[PDB]
Design a binder for this molecule. Structure first.
Ligand code: FES
Length: 96
């Protein structure tokens, strides 16, 4: 399947279609949309975002704890969409 992913960036909303087997960061980059990252391995805070609605699979990220996951935090470099999803990006500072 492929899902509608709305990214609310610091400079506005942009929508893109992300296959369920492509990481959200990776699709964004291919579609010309600059999101922050560092490790691209699921083990830092750089690519942090917060889910507004919808769901992702980020099993196999390691940095976020269950508290942070329960509060909607997502590492965009190691997250696949599992429904249409709305995600605020560039949220490291708020995490961190
Ligand atoms: S860029 Fe480090 S966890 Fe995503």
């Amino acid at each position: 399947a492929t899902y509608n992913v709305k990214l609310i960036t610091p400079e506005g909303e942009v929508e893109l279609q992300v296959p369920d087997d492509v990481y959200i960061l990776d699709q964004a980059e291919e579609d010309g949309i600059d999101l922050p990252y560092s490790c691209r391995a699921g083990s830092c805070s750089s690519c942090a975002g917060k889910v507004v609605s919808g769901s992702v699979d980020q099993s196999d990220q390691s940095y976020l704890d269950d508290g942070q996951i329960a509060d909607g935090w997502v590492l965009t470099c190691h997250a696949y969409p599992t429904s249409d999803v709305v995600i605020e990006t560039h949220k490291e500072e708020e995490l961190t």
